[PDB]
Write a protein that binds this DNA or RNA. Structure first.
Lengths: 203, 141, 226, 260
RNA sequence: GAAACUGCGAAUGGCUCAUUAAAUCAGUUAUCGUUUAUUUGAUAGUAUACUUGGAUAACCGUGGUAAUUCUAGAG
RNA sequence: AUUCAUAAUAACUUUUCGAAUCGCAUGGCCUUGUGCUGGCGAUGGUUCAUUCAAAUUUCUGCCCUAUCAACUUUCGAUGGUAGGAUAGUGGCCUACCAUGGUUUCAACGGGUAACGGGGAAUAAGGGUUCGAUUCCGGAGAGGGAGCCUGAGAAACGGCUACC
């Protein structure tokens, strides 16, 4: 099958090598997973040493990290917007490592609203401002008011991340290897990395 | 020579710069000491280049053979080939013949290399089809 | 074709050689699993309904479930497939099998009686054969006799009688999963070992902590001397 | 080739076993265990070729199936168990105890020891690091791991292991002036004292040693084994010869002194 | 104490030298670049239970093919 | 020499496993209940270490041939970034990018009536010739290729296909 040997290559001088043995099992390769966004479908592969890999064929959700806040939530992948290796992966919505995705911002919104007692998005929408104003003042005890007050100051986030929350979709990058671990995890894009990928996306 | 000249964002893996803590608004940079009496060049510590194959600001370690040779080509990106002259002994004639080997080595942006220079390279893990060595010291020639 | 007719309810089996093609025309184009009525097949089979369960063709190749063919196909068989018993772990063979659709090219057609219509049969419906072994697992015995979880299962175990010359005796199945003082002894022993192990580990960690503290404080005064 | 080897050709056997050339095609392949295949001494060899108790391998299996043989206080039923350096061999039915210690000749000499000394063993510390739950441990040269070792125990140190409990009694620091024994190379088996340790980063550490007769000989740090605190005071019993090298003329003279 | 289910071994050995010219191999290195049955040491009190199921082989019986270490119904 | 060992926080998982197993003996406690307890072993099972091993790997070293002088890069050739795949590194493969890599110090090509070495004969010295073959390493099982099982095989006294 697929082989990872280097003996089938030409020499560094350009010489053609002669075959030295038949293909070995300890030098095999396998087909790519080509993970798509869809209802979960994970297959198991028995590997060298009797070990076991998981090939993500389709995945709906992933574990995503907010690095500057130190909290990670299980949210929903909305799609792929950018892939450095190949734009065809974007076009077909193929999840690999380093792909830039949009995830649902809902769980992170709940965490931030519960934690700092504020709102994200800056969208004074018709029904949006109703929610924003209600979140501003809720039914809430006094020691919790004080803990939130102490938590303010470290409550504003950077503008570029904040402006995204009005859509419910945050930009993110996959960090796991879905074809290997069977999971599609990542972190929220922030800082100059976010600025770089926004510059690429606007083209 | 901008750092971000690729499709993907260039970063050192797992070195997190928080955009929220407070001022000192520059990205933190990791580097290491390779050991064996080699100094970390200043461009590695206060530099801004990203190079996962650098011995100092990258994930490759130096271990095994230490070689020296003359640089004969700098026409690849971040890779050089060096020439190692030596003398082979032929016992029957009690004499020598001139021989040479070409070795490909990674060169970090922390160094500056030109053809005609003598460099010391340390052995790393295979980082290319032909590269197993990495520049650790550049001598002007 | 012959008809290997069997009767699961009484465990009777016998083969019937029907050489008349027009009789067994209701079997044609039917599948294993499908059920048929025997009014057209013969005359004694009036009111009977049979389930087609397989058979072998004129060359002896068995019928196999799932092969949608009245003809022979060639399949790669592995562990679990019918019509093949693997000889080595992981071994697969490619073998010829007959499809599940009944046609006229079959040497035999295995049948199972589903319902007994109006008459009897010579050696199938009018007789019975006993089961060969009784229950052996404890709760199988209990569910066989409806026994509750209080009755001593040991005294209701079936015991076949074996004769030898004149000294006739009984053979009784050993029962599995039967609780004895030995099994409870082992269940006690495993937990006792776990708890004792945890105690020794806690003692070792405590001793290490005491050693660390002694070194720490003697270091405090030793560097306080200098 | 397709998997592990299970036979051992007789000419491929280690040279310290003193195997004859013509007894057969094969030699006992030592099992996997606490010592390296090349630096071990399988029990069948020890009880057949050395002690001469058994006449053949089938008798070695007859002996060992009856619980007679113990190594480090534990009964072994493995005819090819990889007994190695410092291992204590005990024969209860004959009430007899042995320790495998190299002689100056480079062989595992047959060394009878007392029952009181047959209750511990020395062990060279190979590494120390923390395990699961933050617990530190050291590894000896026989694959023994001991949890909660003394905070001062480092590599190349020797610990005194209590065989009944597997716990560390006391340890010896590696430093200048220590009584050591050479466990590899040309100087296998010779006992000396540390004079100077020479360091080479990335390469090999050399250790200058000196015998009781003042001859200095250098050896790789990997082949050193700390066996005593000072000169003349080891923590184990020495083989007949005290680990002292004699020239060929000297051994000829001593042989003709005790046989003529 | 047959049969059969389960476990392990069958990747060792033995044979041969066709292919193979920086390949094999030799002496030296490296794994801070990995997998590792087995052996030997350690190693887990985790936030219906006086012990759960329901198949299946061996076995009985009906058999098909000229023929195979083929096997099929059914209990 | 490390982003090592290890520890911590937030979560995650078609939730891994923290014993529904076996043989001998069966003793001890009285609040005598078919109570509570407990000796020597078998087989298990997570992780680390160790051992038996594998897989890649640095440096240097091969016979004849120019009636072989240029070779490699179409369809990976040399290198860079990202990914996929692998037990893992690596053009090992893919996408994008650069134009590199070897060579009269003999590359590339051709021949070998070439498996390599430990070794053998001859032997002033220097050399010349032999080594399929008792040991070590490699490769193969009529020829190719593809696989299952398994810790480990691209196994052939295993399977699949073609000749």
């Amino acid at each position: 099958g697929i082989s990872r040997d280097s003996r089938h290559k030409r020499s560094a001088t350009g010489a053609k090598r002669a075959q030295f043995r038949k293909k070995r099992k300890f030098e095999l390769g396998r087909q790519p997973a080509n993970t798509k966004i869809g209802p979960k479908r994970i297959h198991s592969v028995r590997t060298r040493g009797g070990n076991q890999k998981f090939r993500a064929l389709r995945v709906e959700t992933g574990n995503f990290s907010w690095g500057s806040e130190g909290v990670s939530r299980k949210t929903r992948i909305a799609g792929v917007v950018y892939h450095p290796s190949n734009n065809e992966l974007v076009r077909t919505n193929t999840l690999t490592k380093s792909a830039v995705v949009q995830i649902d911002a809902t769980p992170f919104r709940q965490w931030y609203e519960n934690h700092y007692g504020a709102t994200l998005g800056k969208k004074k929408g018709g029904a949006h401002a109703a929610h924003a104003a209600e979140v501003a003042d809720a039914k809430r005890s006094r020691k919790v008011e004080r803990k939130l007050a102490a938590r303010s100051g470290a409550a504003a986030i950077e503008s570029a991340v904040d402006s995204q929350f009005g859509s419910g979709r945050l930009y993110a990058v996959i960090s796991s290897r879905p074809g290997q671990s069977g999971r599609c995890d990542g972190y929220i894009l922030e800082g100059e990395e976010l600025a770089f990928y926004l510059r690429r996306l606007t083209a | 020579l901008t750092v971000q000249s690729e499709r993907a964002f260039q970063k050192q893996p797992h070195i997190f710069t928080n955009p929220k803590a407070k001022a000192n608004k520059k990205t933190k940079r990791w580097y290491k000491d390779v050991g064996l009496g080699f100094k970390t060049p200043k461009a590695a510590i206060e530099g801004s280049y990203i190079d996962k194959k650098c011995p100092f600001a990258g994930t490759v370690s130096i271990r095994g053979k230490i070689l020296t040779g003359t640089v004969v080509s700098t026409k690849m990106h971040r890779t050089i080939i060096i020439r190692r002259d030596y003398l082979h002994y032929v016992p029957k004639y009690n004499r020598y013949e001139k021989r040479h080997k070409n070795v490909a080595a990674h060169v970090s942006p922390a160094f500056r290399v030109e053809e005609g220079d003598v460099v010391t390279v340390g052995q790393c893990r295979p980082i290319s089809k032909t590269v197993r060595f990495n520049v650790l010291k550049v001598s002007a020639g | 074709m012959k008809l290997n007719i069997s009767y699961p309810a009484n465990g009777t089996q016998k083969s019937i050689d029907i050489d008349d093609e027009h009789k067994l025309r209701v079997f044609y184009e039917k599948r294993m699993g499908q059920e048929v009525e025997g009014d057209s097949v013969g005359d004694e089979f009036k009111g009977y309904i049979f389930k087609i369960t397989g058979g072998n063709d004129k060359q002896g190749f068995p019928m196999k479930q799932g092969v949608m063919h009245p003809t022979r196909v060639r399949l790669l068989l592995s562990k679990g497939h019918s019509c093949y018993r693997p000889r080595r772990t992981g071994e697969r063979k490619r073998k010829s099998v007959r499809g599940c659709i009944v046609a006229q090219d079959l040497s035999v057609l295995a049948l199972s009686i589903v319902k007994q219509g109006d008459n009897e049969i010579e050696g199938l419906t009018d007789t019975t054969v006993p089961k060969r072994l009784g229950p052996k697992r404890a709760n199988h015995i209990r569910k066989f006799f409806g026994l509750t979880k209080e009755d001593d299962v040991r005294d209701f175990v079936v015991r076949r009688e074996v004769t030898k010359g004149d000294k006739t005796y009984t053979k009784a199945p050993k029962i599995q999963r039967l609780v004895t003082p030995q099994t409870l002894q082992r269940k006690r022993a495993l937990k006792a070992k776990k708890v004792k192990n945890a105690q020794q580990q806690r003692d070792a960690a405590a001793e290490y902590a005491q050693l660390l503290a002694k070194r720490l404080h003697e270091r405090k005064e030793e560097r306080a001397e200098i | 080739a397709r998997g592990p080897k299970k036979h051992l050709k007789r000419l491929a056997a280690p040279s310290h076993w003193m195997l004859d050339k013509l007894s057969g095609t094969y030699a006992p392949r030592p099992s996997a265990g606490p010592h390296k295949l090349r630096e071990s001494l399988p029990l069948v060899v020890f009880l057949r070729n050395r002690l001469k108790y058994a006449l053949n391998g089938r008798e070695v299996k007859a002996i060992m199936m009856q619980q007679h043989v113990q190594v480090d206080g534990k009964v072994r039923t493995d005819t090819t168990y990889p007994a190695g350096f410092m291992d204590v061999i005990t024969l209860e039915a004959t009430n007899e105890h042995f320790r495998l210690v190299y002689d100056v000749k480079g062989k595992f000499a047959v060394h009878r020891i007392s029952a009181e000394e047959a209750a511990y063993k020395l062990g060279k510390v190979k590494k120390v690091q923390l395990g699961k739950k933050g617990v530190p441990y050291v590894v000896t040269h026989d694959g023994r791991t001991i949890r909660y070792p003394d905070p001062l125990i480092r590599a190349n140190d020797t610990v005194k292991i209590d065989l009944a409990t597997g716990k560390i009694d006391d340890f010896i620091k590696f430093d200048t002036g220590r009584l050591v024994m050479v466990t590899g190379g040309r100087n296998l088996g010779r006992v000396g004292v540390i004079v100077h340790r020479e360091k080479h980063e990335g390469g090999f550490d050399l250790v200058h040693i000196k015998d009781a007769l003042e001859n200095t000989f250098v050896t790789r740090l990997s082949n050193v084994f700390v066996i005593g605190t000072e000169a003349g005071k080891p923590w184990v019993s020495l083989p007949k010869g005290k680990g002292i090298k004699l020239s060929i003329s000297e051994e000829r003279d001593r042989r003709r002194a005790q046989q003529g």
